[PDB]
Amino acid sequence: EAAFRQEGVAVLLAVVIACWLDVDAITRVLLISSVMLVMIVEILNSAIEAVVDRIGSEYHELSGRAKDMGSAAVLIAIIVAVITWCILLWSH
Amino acid sequence: GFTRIIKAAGYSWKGLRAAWINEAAFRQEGVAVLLAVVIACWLDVDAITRVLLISSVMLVMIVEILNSAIEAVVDRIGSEYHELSGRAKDMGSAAVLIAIIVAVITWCILLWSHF
Amino acid sequence: FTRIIKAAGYSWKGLRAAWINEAAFRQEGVAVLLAVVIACWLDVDAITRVLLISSVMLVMIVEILNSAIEAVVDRIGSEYHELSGRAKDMGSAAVLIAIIVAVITWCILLWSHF
């Protein structure tokens, strides 16, 4: 997957970066586990899109709403990543 | 390259708002979540703890959206097939419940620590 | 308020379902309750107790979601050959990532404290 390697890249980079920076163990944990929250959610979204692909041919509100919601969940996870990193790095 | 990102954002918006309008059980949690966040922001506390209360709340949020996705799928199957197990929606609901339990407990312990 | 108590009932039946139907759910259950109790035995910074437990419960929630996905795949591929075993595989992968997070979190935190 193309974009899963885009966020894969974003996640591994974010992790490595969060490790190079000397930071409180708790805070390294928070950064890492935040970006990993994003990771897990994305894999779940992959699973959903897999099931939506398995069943049905046509567009439905029922069928599109699902994938749309998955994408939304991913977006929320990333918002959490952004905000978490923001507040923690601001705390300094 | 950058177009894909904005398309994803768009789908995210249409799906988040689909989640909002097509469900009235997602708004109780919406209110509870935004309120919990705001409240967690006007109280004085260390940044790490802000991060924690808020992220517990948002864990609940994300899980809820996923549950919405599952129920959409089951709606799709229930259209095609005739009988529904209903074991999927139940477990989604269970996941949400666990997330909220985490919220409650997290807030409990943190607020006990500080106060 | 009953519109909430019905949801609680559904959570309970769906959890007795997740528990009993999956003969494997119980394992991660043991690991998680043990991890929680142990993390409560240890005298730690409230924040850190919260984090340990949060990692563990993250694993829990992800696991339940995976059970949900598995149920869906069951209803579908009852008699049908599937190009969607990858769905369940992704689920299992998500669980694995959650547990990796648990392991790493506990590692770093206990290293810090000790």
Side-chain angles (χ1 to χ4, degrees), chain B residues 22-58:
Chain B
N22 279 84
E23 265 188 9
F26 175 71
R27 294 186 243 99
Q28 312 213 298
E29 259 89 43
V31 167
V33 152
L34 182 50
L35 283 190
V37 163
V38 170
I39 292 159
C41 295
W42 295 127
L43 303 179
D44 172 44
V45 79
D46 59 316
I48 289 182
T49 308
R50 278 224 204 279
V51 165
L52 290 194
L53 296 171
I54 292 183
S55 79
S56 197
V57 173
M58 299 309 292

Short mmCIF file of all heavy atoms in Angstrom, two decimals, chain B residues 22-58:
data_model
loop_
_atom_site.label_atom_id
_atom_site.label_comp_id
_atom_site.label_asym_id
_atom_site.label_seq_id
_atom_site.Cartn_x
_atom_site.Cartn_y
_atom_site.Cartn_z
N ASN B 22 -26.13 11.00 10.95
CA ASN B 22 -26.78 9.68 10.92
C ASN B 22 -26.87 8.95 12.27
O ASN B 22 -27.37 7.82 12.33
CB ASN B 22 -26.12 8.75 9.90
CG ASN B 22 -26.59 9.00 8.47
OD1 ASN B 22 -26.09 9.88 7.78
ND2 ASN B 22 -27.55 8.20 8.02
N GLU B 23 -26.36 9.56 13.34
CA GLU B 23 -26.43 8.95 14.67
C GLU B 23 -26.60 9.93 15.82
O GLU B 23 -25.90 10.95 15.90
CB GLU B 23 -25.23 8.05 14.92
CG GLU B 23 -25.49 6.60 14.60
CD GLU B 23 -24.36 5.71 15.04
OE1 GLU B 23 -23.47 6.22 15.75
OE2 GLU B 23 -24.35 4.51 14.69
N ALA B 24 -27.52 9.61 16.72
CA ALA B 24 -27.79 10.43 17.90
C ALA B 24 -27.17 9.83 19.15
O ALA B 24 -27.41 10.31 20.26
CB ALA B 24 -29.29 10.61 18.08
N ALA B 25 -26.40 8.76 18.98
CA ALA B 25 -25.69 8.15 20.11
C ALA B 25 -24.23 8.57 20.05
O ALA B 25 -23.46 8.34 20.99
CB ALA B 25 -25.82 6.64 20.06
N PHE B 26 -23.88 9.19 18.94
CA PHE B 26 -22.55 9.72 18.71
C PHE B 26 -22.47 11.17 19.16
O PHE B 26 -21.39 11.75 19.25
CB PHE B 26 -22.20 9.60 17.22
CG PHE B 26 -20.88 10.22 16.85
CD1 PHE B 26 -19.68 9.64 17.25
CD2 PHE B 26 -20.83 11.38 16.09
CE1 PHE B 26 -18.47 10.20 16.90
CE2 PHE B 26 -19.62 11.95 15.74
CZ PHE B 26 -18.44 11.36 16.14
N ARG B 27 -23.62 11.77 19.46
CA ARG B 27 -23.64 13.16 19.87
C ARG B 27 -23.58 13.30 21.39
O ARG B 27 -23.07 14.30 21.90
CB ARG B 27 -24.84 13.90 19.28
CG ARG B 27 -24.77 14.01 17.77
CD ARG B 27 -25.89 14.86 17.20
NE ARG B 27 -26.77 14.09 16.33
CZ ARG B 27 -27.94 13.58 16.71
NH1 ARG B 27 -28.37 13.76 17.95
NH2 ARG B 27 -28.67 12.90 15.85
N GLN B 28 -24.10 12.31 22.10
CA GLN B 28 -23.97 12.28 23.55
C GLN B 28 -22.49 12.21 23.92
O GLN B 28 -22.00 12.96 24.78
CB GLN B 28 -24.76 11.09 24.12
CG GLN B 28 -26.19 11.00 23.57
CD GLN B 28 -27.19 10.45 24.58
OE1 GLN B 28 -27.08 9.32 25.04
NE2 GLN B 28 -28.18 11.27 24.94
N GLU B 29 -21.77 11.34 23.22
CA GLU B 29 -20.32 11.22 23.35
C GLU B 29 -19.58 12.43 22.79
O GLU B 29 -18.49 12.74 23.24
CB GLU B 29 -19.82 9.96 22.64
CG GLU B 29 -19.52 8.78 23.57
CD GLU B 29 -20.72 7.89 23.81
OE1 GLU B 29 -21.46 7.57 22.85
OE2 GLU B 29 -20.93 7.48 24.98
N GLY B 30 -20.14 13.10 21.79
CA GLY B 30 -19.52 14.29 21.24
C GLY B 30 -19.51 15.39 22.28
O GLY B 30 -18.48 16.01 22.55
N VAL B 31 -20.68 15.61 22.88
CA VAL B 31 -20.85 16.59 23.94
C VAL B 31 -19.95 16.26 25.12
O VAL B 31 -19.17 17.10 25.57
CB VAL B 31 -22.30 16.60 24.44
CG1 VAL B 31 -22.41 17.37 25.75
CG2 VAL B 31 -23.21 17.17 23.37
N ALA B 32 -20.07 15.03 25.60
CA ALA B 32 -19.26 14.57 26.72
C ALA B 32 -17.77 14.74 26.46
O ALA B 32 -17.02 15.12 27.35
CB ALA B 32 -19.58 13.12 27.04
N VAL B 33 -17.35 14.47 25.23
CA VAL B 33 -15.94 14.55 24.85
C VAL B 33 -15.44 15.99 24.79
O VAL B 33 -14.41 16.31 25.39
CB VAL B 33 -15.65 13.81 23.51
CG1 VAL B 33 -14.45 14.42 22.78
CG2 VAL B 33 -15.45 12.32 23.74
N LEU B 34 -16.15 16.86 24.07
CA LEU B 34 -15.73 18.25 23.96
C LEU B 34 -15.76 18.95 25.31
O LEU B 34 -14.84 19.72 25.65
CB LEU B 34 -16.57 19.02 22.94
CG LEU B 34 -16.13 20.48 22.76
CD1 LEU B 34 -14.62 20.57 22.50
CD2 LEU B 34 -16.90 21.17 21.65
N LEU B 35 -16.80 18.68 26.08
CA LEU B 35 -16.89 19.17 27.44
C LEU B 35 -15.72 18.68 28.28
O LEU B 35 -15.05 19.48 28.91
CB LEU B 35 -18.21 18.78 28.10
CG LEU B 35 -19.41 19.60 27.65
CD1 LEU B 35 -20.63 19.32 28.50
CD2 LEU B 35 -19.09 21.08 27.69
N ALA B 36 -15.46 17.38 28.27
CA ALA B 36 -14.35 16.82 29.04
C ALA B 36 -13.02 17.46 28.65
O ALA B 36 -12.19 17.72 29.51
CB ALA B 36 -14.29 15.31 28.87
N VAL B 37 -12.83 17.71 27.36
CA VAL B 37 -11.60 18.32 26.87
C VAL B 37 -11.46 19.75 27.39
O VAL B 37 -10.44 20.10 27.99
CB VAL B 37 -11.54 18.33 25.34
CG1 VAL B 37 -10.48 19.31 24.85
CG2 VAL B 37 -11.26 16.94 24.81
N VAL B 38 -12.48 20.56 27.14
CA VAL B 38 -12.50 21.94 27.59
C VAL B 38 -12.25 22.04 29.10
O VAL B 38 -11.39 22.80 29.56
CB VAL B 38 -13.82 22.63 27.20
CG1 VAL B 38 -13.94 23.98 27.87
CG2 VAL B 38 -13.92 22.77 25.68
N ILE B 39 -13.00 21.25 29.86
CA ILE B 39 -12.85 21.18 31.31
C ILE B 39 -11.42 20.83 31.68
O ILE B 39 -10.82 21.47 32.54
CB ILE B 39 -13.78 20.13 31.93
CG1 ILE B 39 -15.24 20.57 31.81
CG2 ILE B 39 -13.43 19.89 33.40
CD1 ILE B 39 -16.22 19.43 31.92
N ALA B 40 -10.87 19.82 31.01
CA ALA B 40 -9.49 19.40 31.25
C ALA B 40 -8.48 20.48 30.86
O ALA B 40 -7.32 20.42 31.27
CB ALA B 40 -9.19 18.11 30.51
N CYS B 41 -8.93 21.47 30.08
CA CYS B 41 -8.06 22.57 29.68
C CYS B 41 -8.13 23.79 30.61
O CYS B 41 -7.14 24.50 30.78
CB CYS B 41 -8.34 22.99 28.24
SG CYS B 41 -7.94 21.71 27.01
N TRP B 42 -9.29 24.07 31.21
CA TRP B 42 -9.33 25.24 32.09
C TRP B 42 -8.91 24.99 33.53
O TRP B 42 -8.68 25.92 34.30
CB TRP B 42 -10.68 25.96 32.03
CG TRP B 42 -10.91 26.54 30.68
CD1 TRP B 42 -11.99 26.35 29.87
CD2 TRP B 42 -10.00 27.38 29.94
NE1 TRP B 42 -11.83 27.03 28.69
CE2 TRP B 42 -10.62 27.67 28.71
CE3 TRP B 42 -8.74 27.93 30.22
CZ2 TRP B 42 -10.01 28.48 27.75
CZ3 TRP B 42 -8.14 28.73 29.26
CH2 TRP B 42 -8.78 29.00 28.04
N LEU B 43 -8.80 23.71 33.89
CA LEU B 43 -8.22 23.33 35.17
C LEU B 43 -6.71 23.43 35.06
O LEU B 43 -6.14 23.10 34.02
CB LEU B 43 -8.61 21.89 35.54
CG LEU B 43 -10.09 21.52 35.63
CD1 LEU B 43 -10.23 20.04 35.97
CD2 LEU B 43 -10.85 22.40 36.62
N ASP B 44 -6.05 23.90 36.12
CA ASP B 44 -4.59 23.91 36.14
C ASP B 44 -4.04 22.53 36.47
O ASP B 44 -4.44 21.91 37.45
CB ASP B 44 -4.07 24.92 37.15
CG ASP B 44 -2.56 24.83 37.34
OD1 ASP B 44 -1.84 24.72 36.32
OD2 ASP B 44 -2.09 24.83 38.50
N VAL B 45 -3.09 22.07 35.65
CA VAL B 45 -2.45 20.77 35.83
C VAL B 45 -1.22 20.65 34.91
O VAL B 45 -1.07 21.42 33.97
CB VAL B 45 -3.46 19.63 35.53
CG1 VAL B 45 -3.60 19.43 34.04
CG2 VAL B 45 -3.03 18.34 36.21
N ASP B 46 -0.34 19.69 35.20
CA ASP B 46 0.85 19.49 34.37
C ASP B 46 0.51 18.99 32.97
O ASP B 46 -0.46 18.24 32.78
CB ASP B 46 1.86 18.56 35.06
CG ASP B 46 1.28 17.19 35.36
OD1 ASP B 46 0.14 17.11 35.84
OD2 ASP B 46 1.99 16.19 35.11
N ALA B 47 1.32 19.39 31.99
CA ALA B 47 1.05 19.15 30.58
C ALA B 47 0.80 17.68 30.25
O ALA B 47 -0.11 17.34 29.49
CB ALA B 47 2.18 19.70 29.72
N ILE B 48 1.62 16.81 30.84
CA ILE B 48 1.48 15.37 30.69
C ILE B 48 0.07 14.90 31.07
O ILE B 48 -0.53 14.07 30.36
CB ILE B 48 2.51 14.62 31.55
CG1 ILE B 48 3.91 14.80 30.96
CG2 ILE B 48 2.17 13.14 31.66
CD1 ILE B 48 5.00 14.06 31.70
N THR B 49 -0.45 15.43 32.16
CA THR B 49 -1.76 15.02 32.64
C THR B 49 -2.90 15.56 31.76
O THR B 49 -3.90 14.85 31.55
CB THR B 49 -1.96 15.42 34.11
OG1 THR B 49 -0.85 14.95 34.89
CG2 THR B 49 -3.24 14.81 34.66
N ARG B 50 -2.73 16.78 31.24
CA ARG B 50 -3.67 17.34 30.26
C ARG B 50 -3.77 16.34 29.13
O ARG B 50 -4.86 15.83 28.80
CB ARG B 50 -3.18 18.68 29.69
CG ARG B 50 -3.44 19.91 30.55
CD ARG B 50 -3.95 21.09 29.71
NE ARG B 50 -3.69 22.38 30.33
CZ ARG B 50 -4.45 22.92 31.28
NH1 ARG B 50 -5.52 22.27 31.73
NH2 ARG B 50 -4.14 24.11 31.79
N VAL B 51 -2.59 16.06 28.58
CA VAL B 51 -2.43 15.08 27.52
C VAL B 51 -3.15 13.77 27.84
O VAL B 51 -3.85 13.24 26.98
CB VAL B 51 -0.94 14.82 27.24
CG1 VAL B 51 -0.77 13.56 26.41
CG2 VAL B 51 -0.33 16.03 26.54
N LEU B 52 -3.02 13.28 29.06
CA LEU B 52 -3.65 12.01 29.43
C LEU B 52 -5.18 12.03 29.51
O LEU B 52 -5.84 11.13 28.96
CB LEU B 52 -3.06 11.48 30.74
CG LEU B 52 -1.61 10.99 30.62
CD1 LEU B 52 -1.22 10.17 31.83
CD2 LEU B 52 -1.44 10.20 29.33
N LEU B 53 -5.75 13.02 30.19
CA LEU B 53 -7.21 13.09 30.32
C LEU B 53 -7.81 13.21 28.93
O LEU B 53 -8.68 12.41 28.53
CB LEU B 53 -7.62 14.30 31.16
CG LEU B 53 -7.18 14.33 32.63
CD1 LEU B 53 -7.46 15.68 33.27
CD2 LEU B 53 -7.84 13.21 33.42
N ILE B 54 -7.30 14.20 28.21
CA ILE B 54 -7.72 14.45 26.84
C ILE B 54 -7.62 13.22 25.94
O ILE B 54 -8.56 12.89 25.21
CB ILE B 54 -6.90 15.60 26.24
CG1 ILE B 54 -7.27 16.91 26.95
CG2 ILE B 54 -7.10 15.70 24.74
CD1 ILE B 54 -6.59 18.13 26.40
N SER B 55 -6.49 12.53 26.00
CA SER B 55 -6.28 11.35 25.16
C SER B 55 -7.15 10.18 25.57
O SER B 55 -7.43 9.31 24.76
CB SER B 55 -4.81 10.92 25.18
OG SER B 55 -4.52 10.18 26.37
N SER B 56 -7.56 10.13 26.83
CA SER B 56 -8.48 9.08 27.26
C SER B 56 -9.81 9.35 26.58
O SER B 56 -10.41 8.47 25.93
CB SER B 56 -8.64 9.11 28.78
OG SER B 56 -9.20 7.90 29.25
N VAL B 57 -10.25 10.60 26.71
CA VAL B 57 -11.46 11.10 26.06
C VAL B 57 -11.47 10.82 24.54
O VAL B 57 -12.48 10.36 23.97
CB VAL B 57 -11.56 12.62 26.32
CG1 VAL B 57 -12.67 13.23 25.54
CG2 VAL B 57 -11.75 12.89 27.81
N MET B 58 -10.34 11.06 23.90
CA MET B 58 -10.23 10.88 22.46
C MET B 58 -10.14 9.41 22.08
O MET B 58 -10.54 9.03 20.99
CB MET B 58 -9.02 11.62 21.93
CG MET B 58 -9.06 13.12 22.15
SD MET B 58 -10.61 13.83 21.59
CE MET B 58 -10.43 13.58 19.83
#
